[PDB]
Design a protein around this ligand. Structure first.
Ligand SMILES: Nc1ccc2c(c1)c(-c1ccccc1)[n+](CCCCCc1cn(CCNc3c4c(nc5ccccc35)CCCC4)nn1)c1cc(N)ccc21
Ligand SMILES: Nc1ccc2c(c1)c(-c1ccccc1)[n+](CCCCCc1cn(CCNc3c4c(nc5ccccc35)CCCC4)nn1)c1cc(N)ccc21
Ligand SMILES: *[C@@H]1O[C@H](CO[C@@H]2O[C@@H](C)[C@@H](O)[C@@H](O)[C@@H]2O)[C@@H](O[C@@H]2O[C@H](CO)[C@@H](O)[C@H](O)[C@H]2NC(C)=O)[C@H](O)[C@H]1NC(C)=O
Ligand SMILES: *[C@@H]1O[C@H](CO[C@@H]2O[C@@H](C)[C@@H](O)[C@@H](O)[C@@H]2O)[C@@H](O)[C@H](O)[C@H]1NC(C)=O
Ligand SMILES: *[C@@H]1O[C@H](CO)[C@@H](O)[C@H](O)[C@H]1NC(C)=O
Ligand SMILES: *[C@@H]1O[C@H](CO)[C@@H](O)[C@H](O)[C@H]1NC(C)=O
Lengths: 537, 538
């Protein structure tokens, strides 16, 4: 006997899902659905091709392979690093998606939530414990979709203008999963006419790039950008910079033994790990929060720079939820700034702070880095190691996340979008990173996905109530484009972010608190002053 | 003699003097007003260093104030007390090198600490005869010997053709140095202690005090110093030899003198004093506020290097300094040249009027530097709010010109061995006629330090009279000991020395002393550390 709730016919054929246990009851999971032809051999660096139909019933009960990527070995065996690392076999044959739906399958078309993972476009997988759609599906009755997209050289190595390596193919893999949803989600009880994209870090940048690319705009209705944006210093590169890095890596892998075709063909003959081995050696400077192969401003997927597109685009019929964590740049420091460690309090000297600023803002001139140091120094306690340590974290998170987010929020708002902004300030009771790291980058995700609801994970009762609140904000947003509950009449209400009032809310254990101005003075420094300083260079 | 008051007859190196017995609220004071300290700097002596006054015969009458040095008379708000109080109160003349002395009546039996006042007025104006500089209260109430002198201002005191013999520049500073030498020689005749001389001044007067700190020949003439809302460093207190040469040459052209220096200077000497005054303001390089045409020059003589170089490298080990600012240093300057500003309206300005004003307020700033200023002083929550824009314009002028040069000075002096005490004067006189938006303007602490509230006829409050008394004690305890704290009083909040480590200063208001940390620390790091690096690279 077969469970009819576990049998779905999609355009490509039949699938068999698995009944999964969530705290409050069962869910139907369809894991490892292929959405594209495996991008192997001659297909490496090429745009994805739709998956060909299959015979019989395809087993969709387990997560599929994780896209070929670099594996972090900074703190081996440490939960804090390991949780972000591949949890399935690495393979170039990784173009699969996952679907979680209520059990039984909803009777009416249900709003769809599509998750796009982060990991600096060099890493990530939709199989990670913190991306588990189980809770959202069970508790909120949502149809949750997550896909794997190619990362690193495989997803973003580009020789701009070539046919064989046009770049942005990882973004195309995501666009193909979005098309798959339009064509097949109704078979799972999902509403193709109510699709919300959500992502964190590189995932949030990806969401933004789908907002700014016209062929993606017909595939979703609302968007959520958690601690990431399409604009900013790390999310994109120029055609020139991508060409430079691709040519250098090819040179590094003894490739060619000339023409775009010749070079790409020889890169295709190379074992996956050979490309990963040299991936990090193509960065122009010693840096942090910089990734070798990221989306390219090609004049195709991205018709112009995200900055140009956000300044001139029409976002009238768009709803966006944007926000940041309390300590965006804290973890980045243990990956390359001398004096920083997870194992000590990381109390730094002034000299170490100045050195760290050159690493944190690698594009900055001597004058620009001096402007940064002078702005982030506490002139009452300018040598205080704690202030210097926290100022170093603030430099990295403001430059890379907070102020690009502030910039996106403002431009979207001014150009017709309905924007809701937040600051996530709750540190998980379960967190293993030091106290000095505060609420690091990515540690709100487990709360949005509702992991505290699993009693085995040992979160507090308040954290379980808080996770439930977040799941409601996110799904009310997916449902209506407003994170506020239409039933709840004693709130306080989450107001839209506007250029005039600059209103955002604090997300913590306490009830919603409304704040105005997202690091307004400091972001005027990054967004208004620093460009004028580098434009007169 | 024989029938005169024997307490009013004193001999100085120059000859005999007759003073006057004045009434102070608490009792009488001796006053010796209009004592000549130099040969009248007229004719061929115009632009020349002062010469010591030759001895006179008979009893020189020292019962009235003497002539005010030739200067521009402010006609912005005619008949208005707010402007008029700063204006000459005696006849204008180039024969103005006179000093005043106030002592207790009867004269002290033992050597008394001396306080020497140096007036402000952007080195273009001022007089030691102004009501707010009245030494009678300090003399009566604190038993102090108070001296104030006239020094040449404008072209007469500071027009220089650097390197020339006929117009070397800084002669107004030399007039001040000559009055300090006069005190060393003659103050003991009035009961004053030449071995305990404290200089005090406000605005250009405070800058003058600082220049005496930085000029070795003045250092032997005083022991302690008070710099109220002014410093030798900063954008307005000095000019380069090049800039002074440019302005003197242009002024000569504007009055009919065609440029060799001897010929030029000789011609300038043939010109009516009023003709120079009528063209004084036309030599400024840009439309500006808080900029004065003829100020001290970096000559490599009086000033061996720039005040900035001198404060960064000097040894101040055996020096005690009292420094401070008022709450609204730049507020009044805006009604003298920033469009949208008036004493008669609330001065609520637009963003465009703020951007325009920043260019007038920071005239030496490039487009990028002016942009850095605007971005720093804008409230990005309410960037178009007229009240914030108005107050930000005042803060730009006050911080650039006073607060941050003062902060720079306090830090450098402290790091280089000086004993520094810093303050913020936040009390607005109940009697003030300037609008409320101006807050505590530049120079409105003076009347409190001099103890004018003690005169009941001036209609100050009882709290203001108690407050004036507190200030007079801080200042005179500082003059006496180099510490503004009373050794008799105990908590009685202590005024701590300002240090690089703790950056401690006090609030001077009607409430008891409150200790604060950092003098506009973030903002002054912008002006003192960042902006120079922006103009050194662009
Ligand atoms: N082997 C080798 C050789 C040379 C270099 C490098 C590696 C690396 C490097 C890249 C990744 C991990 C470790 C090291 N960097 C890059 C260093 C910058 C930091 C990159 C980085 C590393 N990670 C970790 C990813 N995992 C996490 C993720 C998230 N949160 C987290 C919170 C805590 C800890 C880890 C988290 C949320 C989003 C998902 C990823 N995120 N960004 C270089 C920079 C140069 N200029 C030169 C040479 C190298
Ligand atoms: N006739 C004419 C022609 C051309 C110009 C000017 C005048 C003037 C000008 C100077 C003084 C008064 C009125 C106008 N400036 C303005 C520059 C300086 C004005 C700033 C100033 C004015 N005052 C008044 C002096 N008295 C005061 C003093 C103090 N506080 C005060 C508080 C309120 C009112 C007056 C105060 C502190 C102590 C000393 C003097 N002190 N500083 C120009 C700037 C240009 N760029 C170009 C041309 C001119
Ligand atoms: C904080 O730690 C860093 C890293 O040191 C490592 O982690 C420590 C907790 C401990 O296990 C050390 O032995 C490890 O080396 C310190 O910086 C390094 O210090 C070592 C000497 O101990 C030196 O050889 C390395 O070059 C340094 N590396 C870097 C990146 O700076 C740092 O000094 C520690 N800070 C404090 C406040 O103690
Ligand atoms: C304030 O005043 C400025 C100067 O205008 C003059 O003074 C005012 C008080 C009137 O008497 C007027 O007739 C004079 O011309 C103006 O430039 C400025 O715009 C005014 N600001 C406001 C907010 O009213
Ligand atoms: C939760 O706590 C219990 C009891 O201490 C422990 O046995 C269990 O392993 C913990 N679970 C996790 C996920 O750490
Ligand atoms: C003091 O007050 C009286 C009474 O109102 C008034 O006539 C006099 O002119 C005032 N004097 C001053 C200096 O304000």
């Amino acid at each position: 006997r077969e469970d009819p709730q576990l049998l779905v016919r999609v355009r490509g054929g039949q699938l068999r899902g698995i009944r999964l246990k969530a705290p409050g009851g069962p869910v139907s999971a369809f894991l490892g659905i292929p959405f594209a032809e495996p991008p192997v051999g001659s297909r490496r660096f090429m745009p994805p091709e739709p998956k060909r139909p299959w015979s019989g019933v395809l087993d969709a009960t387990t997560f599929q392979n994780v896209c070929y990527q670099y594996v972090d070995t900074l703190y081996p065996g440490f939960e804090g690093t390991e949780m972000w690392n591949p949890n399935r076999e690495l393979s170039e044959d990784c173009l699969y998606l996952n679907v979680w739906t209520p059990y039984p399958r909803p009777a009416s078309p249900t709003p769809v939530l599509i998750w796009i993972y982060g990991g600096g476009f060099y890493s990530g997988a939709a199989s990670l414990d913190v991306y588990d759609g189980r809770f959202l599906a069970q508790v909120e009755g949502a149809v949750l979709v997550s896909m794997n997209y190619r990362v690193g050289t495989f997803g973003f190595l580009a020789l701009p203008g070539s046919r064989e390596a046009p770049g942005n193919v990882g973004l195309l893999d995501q666009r193909l999963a979005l098309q798959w949803v339009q064509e097949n989600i109704a078979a799972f009880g999902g509403d193709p006419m109510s699709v919300t994209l959500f992502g964190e870090s590189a995932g949030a940048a990806s969401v933004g790039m789908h907002i700014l690319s016209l062929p993606s705009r017909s595939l979703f209705h609302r968007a959520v950008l958690q601690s990431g944006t399409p604009n900013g210093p790390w999310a994109t590169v120029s055609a020139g910079e991508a060409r430079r890095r691709a040519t250098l890596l090819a040179r590094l892998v003894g490739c060619p033994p000339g023409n775009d075709t010749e070079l790409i063909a020889c890169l295709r003959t190379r074992p996956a790990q050979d490309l990963v081995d040299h991936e990090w050696h193509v960065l122009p400077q010693e840096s942090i929060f910089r990734f070798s192969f990221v989306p390219v401003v090609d004049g195709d997927f991205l018709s112009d720079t995200p900055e140009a597109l956000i300044n001139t685009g029409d976002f009238q019929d768009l709803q966006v939820l944007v926000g940041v964590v309390k300590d965006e740049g804290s973890y980045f420091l243990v990956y390359g700034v001398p004096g920083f460690s997870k194992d000590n309090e990381s109390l730094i000297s002034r000299a170490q702070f100045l050195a760290g600023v050159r690493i944190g803002v690698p594009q900055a001139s001597d004058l620009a880095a001096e402007a940064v140091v002078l702005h982030y120094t506490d002139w009452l306690h300018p040598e205080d190691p704690t202030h210097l340590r926290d100022a170093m974290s603030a430099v990295v998170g403001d430059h890379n996340v907070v102020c690009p987010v502030a910039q996106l929020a403002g431009r979207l708002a001014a150009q017709g979008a309905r924007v809701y902004a937040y600051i996530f300030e709750h540190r998980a009771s379960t967190l293993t990173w030091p106290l000095w790291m505060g609420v690091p980058h990515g540690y709100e995700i487990e709360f949005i996905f509702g992991l505290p609801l699993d009693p085995s994970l040992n979160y507090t009762t308040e954290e379980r109530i808080f996770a439930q609140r977040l799941m409601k904000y996110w799904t009310n947003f997916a449902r209506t484009g407003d994170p506020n509950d239409p039933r709840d009449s004693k709130s306080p209400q989450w107001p839209p972010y506007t250029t005039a009032a600059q209103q955002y809310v604090s997300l913590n254990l306490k009830p919603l608190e409304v704040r105005r101005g997202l690091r307004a003075q400091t972001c005027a420094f990054w967004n208004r002053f620093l460009p004028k300083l580098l434009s007169a260079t």
